[PDB]
Amino acid sequence: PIVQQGQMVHQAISPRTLNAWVKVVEEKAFSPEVIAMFSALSEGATPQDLNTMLNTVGGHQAAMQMLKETINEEAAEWDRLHPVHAGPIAPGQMREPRGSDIAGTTSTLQEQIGWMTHNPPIPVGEIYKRWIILGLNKIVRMYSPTSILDIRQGPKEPFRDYVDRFYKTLRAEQASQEVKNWMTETLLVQNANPDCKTILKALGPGATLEEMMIACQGV
Amino acid sequence: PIVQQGQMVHQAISPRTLNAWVKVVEEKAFSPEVIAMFSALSEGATPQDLNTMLNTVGGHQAAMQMLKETINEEAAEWDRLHPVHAGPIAPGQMREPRGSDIAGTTSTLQEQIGWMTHNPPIPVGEIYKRWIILGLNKIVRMYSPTSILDIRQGPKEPFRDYVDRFYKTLRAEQASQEVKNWMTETLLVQNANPDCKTILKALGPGATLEEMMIACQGV
Amino acid sequence: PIVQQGQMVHQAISPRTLNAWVKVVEEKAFSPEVIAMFSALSEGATPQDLNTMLNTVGGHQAAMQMLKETINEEAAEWDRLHPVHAGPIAPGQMREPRGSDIAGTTSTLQEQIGWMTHNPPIPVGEIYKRWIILGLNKIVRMYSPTSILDIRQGPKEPFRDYVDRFYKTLRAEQASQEVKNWMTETLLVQNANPDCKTILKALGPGATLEEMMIACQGV
Amino acid sequence: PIVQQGQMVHQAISPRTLNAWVKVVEEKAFSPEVIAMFSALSEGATPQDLNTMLNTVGGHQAAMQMLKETINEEAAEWDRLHPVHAGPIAPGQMREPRGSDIAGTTSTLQEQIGWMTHNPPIPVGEIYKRWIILGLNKIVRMYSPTSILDIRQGPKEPFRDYVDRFYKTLRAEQASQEVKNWMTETLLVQNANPDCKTILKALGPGATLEEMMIACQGV
Amino acid sequence: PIVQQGQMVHQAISPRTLNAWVKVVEEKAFSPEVIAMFSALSEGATPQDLNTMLNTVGGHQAAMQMLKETINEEAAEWDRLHPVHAGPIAPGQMREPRGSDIAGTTSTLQEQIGWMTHNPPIPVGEIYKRWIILGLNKIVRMYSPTSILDIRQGPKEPFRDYVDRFYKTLRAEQASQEVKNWMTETLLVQNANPDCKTILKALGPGATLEEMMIACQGV
Amino acid sequence: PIVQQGQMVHQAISPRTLNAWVKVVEEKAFSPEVIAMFSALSEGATPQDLNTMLNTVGGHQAAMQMLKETINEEAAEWDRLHPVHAGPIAPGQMREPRGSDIAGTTSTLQEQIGWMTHNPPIPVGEIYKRWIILGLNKIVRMYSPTSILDIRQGPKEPFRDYVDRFYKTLRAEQASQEVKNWMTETLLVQNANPDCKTILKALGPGATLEEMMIACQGV
Ligand SMILES: [Cl-]
Ligand SMILES: [Cl-]
Ligand SMILES: [Cl-]
Ligand SMILES: [Cl-]
Ligand SMILES: [Cl-]
Ligand SMILES: [Cl-]
Ligand SMILES: [Cl-]
Ligand SMILES: [Cl-]
Ligand SMILES: [Cl-]
Ligand SMILES: [Cl-]
Ligand SMILES: [Cl-]
Ligand SMILES: [Cl-]
Ligand SMILES: [Cl-]
Ligand SMILES: [Cl-]
Ligand SMILES: [Cl-]
Ligand SMILES: [Cl-]
Ligand SMILES: [Cl-]
Ligand SMILES: [Cl-]
Ligand SMILES: [Cl-]
Ligand SMILES: [Cl-]
Ligand SMILES: [Cl-]
Ligand SMILES: [Cl-]
Ligand SMILES: [Cl-]
Ligand SMILES: [Cl-]
Ligand SMILES: [Cl-]
Ligand SMILES: [Cl-]
Ligand SMILES: [Cl-]
Ligand SMILES: [Cl-]
Ligand SMILES: [Cl-]
Ligand SMILES: [Cl-]
Ligand SMILES: [Cl-]
Ligand SMILES: [Cl-]
Ligand SMILES: [Cl-]
Ligand SMILES: [Cl-]
Ligand SMILES: [Cl-]
Ligand SMILES: [Cl-]
């Protein structure tokens, strides 16, 4: 990483950050908290550090390939928007980055260090990290076993376990916040069991989750 | 976090702080010591760091949703009190924060770093942390299985195990210190078994817990 | 904590200090080494840090309540000795602390940081730590199962196991060093078995523990 | 290692970096993620540090010998390109490195520290690290049990497990990116089972992996 | 501890140093390597830190008492040699230490910090550490089960296991290097079995341990 | 140790370096990777630190004695080459070291710190470390169960397991690189089974290990 006397300084990714990242993917495959874990472990990371984390994953090579193809599509999108001009980089400057420079594959650690601390900074680590999170969300979606359309409360299932399953499956749905808003409002109460489904009607369409779970405790 | 040469400096949340936070929620669900643990692990944290801790929680998504709704209500309360004025942020200043900026969702790490160290500081991490603790207390209450009204000493139960159960259940009650004061004074001795319930009367209504447990050791 | 370039600096309590403190109380309840552990883990701690350690204890809430009542009695003793004067705190100064400010309950981290580093320093962490250790000793006493009066050497019990039990029980007795001096001198040899009890007489009343255990090795 | 106030500074390789490296080779023998692990643990390393990691490997001495012979061939290639001139190293300079100086075997830590920080730097750690990775790839190839030519989808094998096996075996193939490109394009779909092999034809020869795995989910 | 910019600085004893020290005494009681461990963990320690390590030992309170009595005897020896003069400590100076000040029992951390860094330094930590090691050696001796006089090679016992037992028992003998020299030279070969006892004679009285163990490999 | 602002600074050996060193010797006795581990853990170490590591070894006291005798022989060799001159050490200088000063036994930490950082430096830690590694190699040799002369490929033994055993036993042989060169060239192919022994002849006497193991894969 790089961490802010106040003069900025470059460290290697620590063994426990790495060991933490690897044990996470061994245990939980790809799920939403894995991505938070990814983002959490990667604070201030250079592309080198990001590639480190991705190459140390053994197994799951279909997912790691999908992620490779995703990164290349964002790189091509970067290239199209940001064309590379001809001519020699004058003394006292640094070259403008390509898509592959941002993905760590055709840049040195110094150039990554150069872009990140320069005024203004081209935040290449943060740009790349987006592309990686993009591709991880695509994977999470694909490997999510169930659709949110199929989360129905069972006859004896206490309401709170039903809400746990609903929102877990919702967390892995790749759809925008307004869609999610609509599924919370439409599907949650729509797919409850007859008993609770009744009990919640009597609160009204704009009641909180805290209000709804207190309603169906006694049920 | 940010930690105080004496010049302030910004670090990433460490892997063990994170690993500690995750293992805590895996093991103990939501109980009062979890919140102390939360507060303890989050010292000096930015909103980014606070969101990190909350998103790495797998499972319990009903609780994490309730917490989401709580945070939005405090944000709306913040917005109403603190309206955002029109006009461009002049050079040498920083914008005044919205509710969503405080919750890390619509601010950068730099802006969070900006507010926290500026003179005077807008302590956004500390404000957000309150809202999160607010919502965690609401959860602890909801998931507490028993009411304090139902903690009765059993015929053979030594007094000290009864006090352990009383104060554990009391710790999860969401009621102010004066109410708690009253429950200690009224209910504790009121719900003891006939034997100890007698033995404590003979001390009087203003005796300490150390005095009461010595009284009922021999019982 | 705060730790001494030489300019003083404020850190958060580390995850392993915390994890160490919690695992200690899970395992060994309240015994004398727990208090050494407490003191050891708390070096340079602010009241915030001290409260952190105490609130992360799950279970044992009778003990944690007793400790609460103890802290309040020392706070009232502090208040009586140190009254708070009327009038506004002039620029370039800091307020004099109340009992509750010392117990971290009605002070900020900055004020605690203020008192500790100021010239002269009001060492609030160290004052509070005393009150906490005070209340922990009261607990250790109460939860000690046996009295020192009841440690008698058994007929086949080698002398060294008897000395181990004597001094362990003595460590949990809440009585001053001169009392302890007297119990070592009177009770140890007085409660040995007939065989060793004899063998030690022949050394005289002012012989060391090293001399006494060599005496009763062959017995 | 050496890690960037901003003045550069030399540290010893930490016990956990070492312990991490050793446990990796105990567990997983030689596979592609081991090399990422190698590269990851070795950031900023001197040749001393690189030799440290290689000598602490117990077992696998055939592989460690092959690696020895590989390093000597790159050293001889270095020597041939970079001949060592006669004459005394003038005051205010440092000698130009031989192949064996780069491999840490005939240089001090100071000389390695000298080359790495000097202006311009001879990056000896990074040069050596290449030679080591070179020899590790040769080992991974040799110890890979299967050829990519033999990865055929089985009749009941869901497509995603087949892709996992394909790309895992591909990761250990020592052939350039254009060859790999060709194997992805030719062999993957060519070696699928009749069912999926059909289903993918109907997308066309230029469809993504995300598109192909969605195609064969329902199969 | 205190550890050497170059300006000296005071740290708390770390949780793992402490946890390491406690686990050592739980596992191995008192043996020679425990003392090396003690010395090793205590580098640069103040008396506070030394007392920390000693009070966190649960169990073994006979040994910890013996150690208490030993420390008091060295303190009285210190007092007799170093009498405390009358009169007020002038501004710009610090008091001369008593025996109890050196044992951490009647001094603050500041005074310990004062003596250690002052010019000239009174190295109180190092003086106390001696007294503690003194008392630990006395304990190791006492708790050593066997005398070196009783280590005889058995008829089938390979020579190297006999040497392992000899020198282990010798390490716990409290006798000076010249005595140890004599026991190596007299007893080792004197207590070997008839076979090896012969075989070594034929080398002569001034042969090394490497020479003697090669001699008795084939036996 | 001592580790390079750029001003040099002295640290204590860390608990995990120590714990790592002790667990290594508990597990693997004395083998070549133990020595790499030794060298690896001891980077920048003073003689104090080196003695720390050696005294914390419990068990194996025959080996630790042999090592003691070895160190004394190198000390006597040092003394003979480097005689100690008469006369008082003038102000602004430091004494020249004896053999026992280098072995940490008759020098302070300050004097060790003095020699190591002075211009020019007498690198006492590095000199001592050599003597210790010298004596460890002598031990490894002695405790190696098998001679390289006895490593013969068995009839069904795949070639690669045979190479693993050959080079493992070779790593523990105490003979120079030219001897080792000769054993690789003469014995390896000379002691293979009839089948492989044939197959390798047909490559010629100057073929690599990578070439030889590919040759005997199909066998
Ligand atoms: Cl820094
Ligand atoms: Cl680390
Ligand atoms: Cl997956
Ligand atoms: Cl890779
Ligand atoms: Cl940009
Ligand atoms: Cl479900
Ligand atoms: Cl800093
Ligand atoms: Cl960490
Ligand atoms: Cl919960
Ligand atoms: Cl998330
Ligand atoms: Cl504010
Ligand atoms: Cl209960
Ligand atoms: Cl600092
Ligand atoms: Cl930590
Ligand atoms: Cl308790
Ligand atoms: Cl709390
Ligand atoms: Cl005061
Ligand atoms: Cl007892
Ligand atoms: Cl530094
Ligand atoms: Cl470390
Ligand atoms: Cl292998
Ligand atoms: Cl080696
Ligand atoms: Cl170069
Ligand atoms: Cl396969
Ligand atoms: Cl410092
Ligand atoms: Cl630590
Ligand atoms: Cl013991
Ligand atoms: Cl104590
Ligand atoms: Cl002195
Ligand atoms: Cl024995
Ligand atoms: Cl430093
Ligand atoms: Cl450490
Ligand atoms: Cl051995
Ligand atoms: Cl020792
Ligand atoms: Cl020299
Ligand atoms: Cl073998």
Numbering used by the authors:
A (entry chain A), B (entry chain A), C (entry chain A), D (entry chain A), E (entry chain A), F (entry chain A): 1 to 4, 7 to 221
Give excerpts from the publication.
During maturation of human immunodeficiency virus type 1 (HIV-1), capsid proteins (CA) assemble into a conical core (or capsid) surrounding the viral genome. Formation of a core with optimal stability is a strict requirement for efficient HIV-1 infection. CA folds into two distinct domains connected by a linker: the N-terminal domain (CANTD), composed of seven α-helices and a single β-hairpin, and the C-terminal domain (CACTD), composed of a 310-helix and four α-helices. The cores comprise ~250 CA hexamers and 12 CA pentamers.
Similar rearrangements are observed in the crystal structure of P38A/T216I, presumably due to the P38A mutation. The compensatory T216I is in helix α11΄΄, proximal to helix α7 of the neighboring intra-hexamer subunit that is affected by the P38A mutation. T216I results in subtle rearrangements close to the mutation site in helix α11΄΄ (mutation site I216΄΄, Q219΄΄, V221΄΄), and also affects helix α10 (I201΄΄, L202΄΄, K203΄΄, A204΄΄) and the loop between α10 and α11 (G206΄΄, P207΄΄, G208΄΄). As a result, there is >200% increase in the IA at the 3-fold CACTD-CACTD inter-hexamer interface, as compared to P38A. Moreover, a ~ 5% increase in the IA is observed at the other CA-CA interfaces. Notably, the T216I substitution instead of reversing the structural changes imparted by P38A, it induces subtle rearrangements that may lead to slight stabilization of the hexamers themselves as well as interactions between them, thus partially offsetting the destabilizing effect of P38A. The second-site mutation T216I is at the 3-fold inter-hexamer interface; it induces further rearrangements that may lead to stabilization of interactions between hexamers, thereby partially offsetting the effect of P38A. Under these conditions, P38A CA does not assemble into tubular structures; however, tubular assembly was rescued by T216I. The P38A/T216I cores became slightly more stable than P38A at later time points. Thus, our observed structural changes at the 3-fold interface in P38A/T216I may explain the rescue of the ability to abrogate TRIM5α restriction.
